[PDB]
Amino acid sequence: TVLLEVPFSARGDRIPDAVAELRTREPIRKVRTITGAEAWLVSSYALCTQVLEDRRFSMKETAAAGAPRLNALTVPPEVVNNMGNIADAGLRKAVMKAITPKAPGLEQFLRDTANSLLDNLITEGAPADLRNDFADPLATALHCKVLGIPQEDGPKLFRSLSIAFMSSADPIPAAKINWDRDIEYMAGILENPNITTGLMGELSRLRKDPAYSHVSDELFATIGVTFFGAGVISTGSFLTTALISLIQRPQLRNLLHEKPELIPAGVEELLRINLSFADGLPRLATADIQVGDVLVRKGELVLVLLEGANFDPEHFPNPGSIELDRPNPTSHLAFGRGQHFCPGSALGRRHAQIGIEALLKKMPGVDLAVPIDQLVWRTRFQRRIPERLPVLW
Numbered sequence: 333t334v335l336l337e338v339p340f341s342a343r344g345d346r347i348p349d350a351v352a353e354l355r356t357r358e359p360i361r362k363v364r365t366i367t368g369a370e371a372w373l374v375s376s377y378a379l380c381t382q383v384l385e386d387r388r389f390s391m392k393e394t395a396a397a398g399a400p401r402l403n404a405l406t407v408p409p410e411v412v413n414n415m416g417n418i419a420d421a422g423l424r425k426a427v428m429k430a431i432t433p434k435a436p437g438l439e440q441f442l443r444d445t446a447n448s449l450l451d452n453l454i455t456e457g458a459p460a461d462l463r464n465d466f467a468d469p470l471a472t473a474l475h476c477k478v479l480g481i482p483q484e485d486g487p488k489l490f491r492s493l494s495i496a497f498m499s500s501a502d503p504i505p506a507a508k509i510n511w512d513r514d515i516e517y518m519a520g521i522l523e524n525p526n527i528t529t530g531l532m533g534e535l536s537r538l539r540k541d542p543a544y545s546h547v548s549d550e551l552f553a554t555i556g557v558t559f560f561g562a563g564v565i566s567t568g569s570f571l572t573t574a575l576i577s578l579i580q581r582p583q584l585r586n587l588l589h590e591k592p593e594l595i596p597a598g599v600e601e602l603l604r605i606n607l608s609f610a611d612g613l614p615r616l617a618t619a620d621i622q623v624g625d626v627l628v629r630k631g632e633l634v635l636v637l638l639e640g641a642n643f644d645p646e647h648f649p650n651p652g653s654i655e656l657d658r659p660n661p662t663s664h665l666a667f668g669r670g671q672h673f674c675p676g677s678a679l680g681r682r683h684a685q686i687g688i689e690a691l692l693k694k695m696p697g698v699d700l701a702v703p704i705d706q707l708v709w710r711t712r713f714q715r716r717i718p719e720r721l722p723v724l725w
């Protein structure tokens with residue numbers, strides 16, 4: 333037989349039995365990626381945390397020419413170091429402040445938008461597609477608001493994402509076409525005097541501030557494209573797969589309906605059990621480093637399997653059960669850990685909380701309209717998502 337291949341499954345509704353077997357028997361072990369490269373797959377909470385907390389396992393270096401690759405780049409190599417470039421330009425604090433959910437009116441915008449989307453679905457009648465006609469539109473509207481760009485530009489930017497977030501063995505010509513076009517769009521936004529709010533409004537002001545005169549226009553536009561893209565794909569995909577986990581747990585669905593103050597704790601458990609990331613997080617070793625029983629060598633690829641950590645019974649007893657009273661509820665790795673911890677974690681939480689709150693109020697009897705095995709799971713993609721999520725209520 334051939335070396336074990338990753339990823340194991342594109343399904344986002346069940347974790348394969350192989351994960352628990354590897355975690356117990358070989359929590360770091362060699363696998364083969366879709367490009368044909370070898371890598372170390374890390375699947376226990378202890379070893380996943382070790383890797384993510386040691387910067388000698390470098391995100392930036394995964395873009396080096398000739399490196400063993402998880403998948404092909406869909407962005408220019410410099411963009412793998414996006415957060416480092418933002419930090420070096422002195423923009424970290426400004427970006428972080430712009431993507432907080434605490435901006436005035438933003439939560440009321442989210443609620444209003446969620447309720448309008450649901451009203452339209454009710455009006456049209458069942459079955460409804462909760463991904464294409466609820467979760468993803470809600471994500472897109474939120475990120476247009478956060479960025480300060482017109483709501484009507486959301487759909488065209490969104491249509492790049494089914495290619496931009498592909499997990500491909502080879503370079504993708506369409507990724508470059510859409511990237512160059514979306515960069516041109518964000519560059520136009522920086523020169524548009526109508527754009528004065530949100531992240532792009534703030535970047536547009538800083539761009540003309542003498543303290544930032546040598547920050548490149550390329551970086552400013554890239555921040556817009558990457559934060560829209562990562563934010564929308566991440567929140568839309570998480571919300572979609574969380575709704576599946578909720579629908580499949582009618583007791584929890586009813587509890588959260590009856591006691592909405594528990595929704596934050598429920599979203600924390602839905603994050604923990606979420607399978608939205610289709611591959612382990614990649615890092616390239618910049619030194620020889622012992623991880624468990626393996627000496628990883630400089631230049632090797634390591635993959636941090638988030639569901640390995642998050643379903644590890646040694647850290648989360650009864651890991652497959654959603655339990656709202658865990659003593660360590662936020663210690664999951666759904667947002668990563670260490671240098672590259674998700675900068676939009678608070679906003680992703682509020683997106684899901686408000687979306688679920690609205691759905692349970694408007695459609696308390698929501699249920700799948702097809703057998704769960706009929707969901708079609710997107711393949712060769714950086715997220716696990718069903719192509720359609722048909723529900724009735």
Ligand code: HEM
Pocket residue numbers: 391412414415431558559560562563564566567570608613614665666667668669671672673674675676677679680681
């Ligand atoms: C529930 C939703 C979200 C999930 C589950 C999520 C998950 C993650 C994870 C696991 C990482 C770490 C990747 C790594 O270490 O290799 C990450 C990074 C990132 N997230 Fe999120 N995220 C979410 C929402 C958002 C939002 C709303 C934004 C922006 C508005 C965003 C922007 C990013 C960016 C830019 C990075 C890269 C950070 C870096 O390179 O250092 N995410 N996200």
Ligand SMILES: O=C1N[C@@H](Cc2ccc(O)c(Cl)c2)C(=O)N[C@H]1Cc1ccc(O)cc1
Pocket residue numbers: 406407411412413414415496497557558559561562566714
């Ligand atoms: O900001 C980044 N940091 C790093 C790390 C990263 C990679 C993939 C992700 O999914 C996440 Cl979430 C993080 C990067 O390589 N690229 C962007 C995100 C991004 C990728 C493609 C695209 O078309 C738009 C944005």
